[PDB]
Subunit: 224 residues, 4 copies
Amino acid sequence: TQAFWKAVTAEFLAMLIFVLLSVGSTINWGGSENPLPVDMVLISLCFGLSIATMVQCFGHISGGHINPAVTVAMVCTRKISIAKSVFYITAQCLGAIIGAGILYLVTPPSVVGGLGVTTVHGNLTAGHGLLVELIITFQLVFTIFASCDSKRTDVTGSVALAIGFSVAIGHLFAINYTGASMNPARSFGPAVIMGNWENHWIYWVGPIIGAVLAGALYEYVFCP
Amino acid sequence: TQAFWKAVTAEFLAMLIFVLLSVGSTINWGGSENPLPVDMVLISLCFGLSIATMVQCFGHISGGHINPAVTVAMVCTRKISIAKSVFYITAQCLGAIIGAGILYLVTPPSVVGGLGVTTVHGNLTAGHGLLVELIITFQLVFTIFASCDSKRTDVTGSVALAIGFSVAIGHLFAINYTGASMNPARSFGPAVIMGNWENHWIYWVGPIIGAVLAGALYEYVFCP
Amino acid sequence: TQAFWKAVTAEFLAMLIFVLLSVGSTINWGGSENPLPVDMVLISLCFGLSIATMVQCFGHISGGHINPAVTVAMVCTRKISIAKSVFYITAQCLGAIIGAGILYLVTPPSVVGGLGVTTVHGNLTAGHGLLVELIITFQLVFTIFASCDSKRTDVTGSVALAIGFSVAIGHLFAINYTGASMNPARSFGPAVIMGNWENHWIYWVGPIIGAVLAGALYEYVFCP
Amino acid sequence: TQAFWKAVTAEFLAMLIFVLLSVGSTINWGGSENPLPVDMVLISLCFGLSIATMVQCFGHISGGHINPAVTVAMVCTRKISIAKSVFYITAQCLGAIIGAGILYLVTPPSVVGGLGVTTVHGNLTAGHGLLVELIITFQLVFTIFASCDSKRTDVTGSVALAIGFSVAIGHLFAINYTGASMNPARSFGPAVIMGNWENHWIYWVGPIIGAVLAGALYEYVFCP
């Protein structure tokens, strides 16, 4: 086992640094430096680069699922056992919370902006709201599967990069609609700290489903 | 055949996600977050990263033409048969429409900004307007051919990346002139939905011609 | 010979597209979309990505000097003969002019912003003004030499990328001081068209010297 | 020895160009082009790209520690001898100063904005202020160790890139809190020139500690 403990550990750590890092960026802009639509590129970028860094950091040591939906679609595709996975998601979930609170600790007088409150922002009926998240986790999910799976026409890019990029695109587009949570873990860490789960289930339902279909289509209908 | 069906399929899907993704970005900025010239980098970037993601996603499974002009220059260079190609463009064309409408469905109260209305914006006589598109599809077209063709001094970069980048540059520069459509498929999906084809032919004429010359110069005059 | 003609040709073409592409970006922002300090990232980025594209496009076919100072430091390092090089610089120089004018042709009513007027902007005595250009062409020059030279600890990045990045950094920083010309060719194409050579020599003197020392230090003092 | 002299030299040079380059960017924005929160992406980006360039430039010739904390965590991990390292940090430290002053020389009438005054900006008690720096140097430190160390599942990305990216993320997030110094050398060069060390020790204490733990965790608890 024990070798596994390191994996769960790396995983707990990767999440904490990411949320702390990412959310910190959304908040950071939440300052008095004339908040502009530029915040979007900046936020989007930070998340996109944080993950690439994280896969770079613990991607080999833990696999790099670092996402409820990703860790979930993994099990259904059948990779990380039903049992071992639950810890993954839990290490992630704490990592979400811990790295978030400590972040909260750093800038308590400007965090109000949310501290990473991924809550169906655009005022559109849950379905239409959840749909966006549905598709994105999918594309992200898909990218990871596509890029990382075994046996390919031999690609020349950084597996570590595209995912960041998928994230990249993910935010740029999804940010205003649903907040582009596209990761239960990251959304969850702030929800414990804000004390508000405005339709939190939406983040588990969409991303997980968006997680399953992409992982599936690749396995089934796309590559036997 | 059937193996082919997957290819047409991947292709239909790649386009839908891209337009939905890309256009969504142009619109998304179309909010009340002080619209600035920053929109440009953001838009430009989203498209540039979306494609890289898409080639990453279905680039191997379908080849990654995902563009009337690209799929067209391919046939003239002689790669995808006259017959098989027509479907490619059609899967793309629907994918343009479907992913666009559903996008329309998500943000119906702010889409007005266009929903991706790539229509010769800069008020300059069609020729001067179409010229820009002429050249860009070319450079994009060229990049793909240059980077992807067989036998090279062995490059060290991500084939998946440069194209995104070509896109990248493409928008940054072409956006205000003609809207930088540089892809019949993407332009077309919104045109069905807006109900306006302000000189739509310009997008088929330029990009296709810009498509043919780049693909040609590489084949003929540059690499026998 | 003739095989060479293609090289000079690719080279003429690469420059034209780059200036047209790059300058177009500086001007493009020169619109009525609330010009902001954001223009910098955008400009910087376009140039940085345009070159990477260009090396990607004609980097193998011509070598990818595409710069008076670069093509010059090459000869002193001794690579492209004294004779063959003069054409290189000339193909580049025309390419600068041709791609620039035609650009001028596209947006004649907003180009006034310069059309790429790389002229010692910051009001600082030529020496202090030329110094900045001195150092940058060097670092760029150096990057190309460092990255591309033969026999290395075997790098894992895109040779095509770093140069773009060197460009990237180059602009971000040098833009306001001297206009970050860092390339005689690109500066020259607009100078013929604006009809003003406000201390044009500064662009040939600095970049060339900045070109020679970097190419030298690598050859001499750094790698025997 | 002498071969070593080149290493110390490359190292002195890399730092100078980086600070000059990076700080120059923070200041450059310090102009009359409507300073916005966009400055952040721009700054963040310049540093992130400057380093990647620098590792690209002298990363092989000197190893690419180019950071007190990095050069320090290296010795504790045991790589560069106790003796040889002190020079490294010193070449870096001068390089910080020299490249900074000369920068100061270029734009003396607008530098006031700081000239790179990485001083615990956010008004939060040293501990909370130093903490941020603590963690970042770590993640950066970690990335370098993770990416560069020997024997790995064989990565497909640019070792030269991730570090830049770690920098990338680093700034985006840390900039407003502590100024995101995340490098004693870079912070130090301006401190000699501003004549103010507002809690300078914070930059040596945090980054060094953040430097040691990341380098450690990788060596110990993560990879025996």
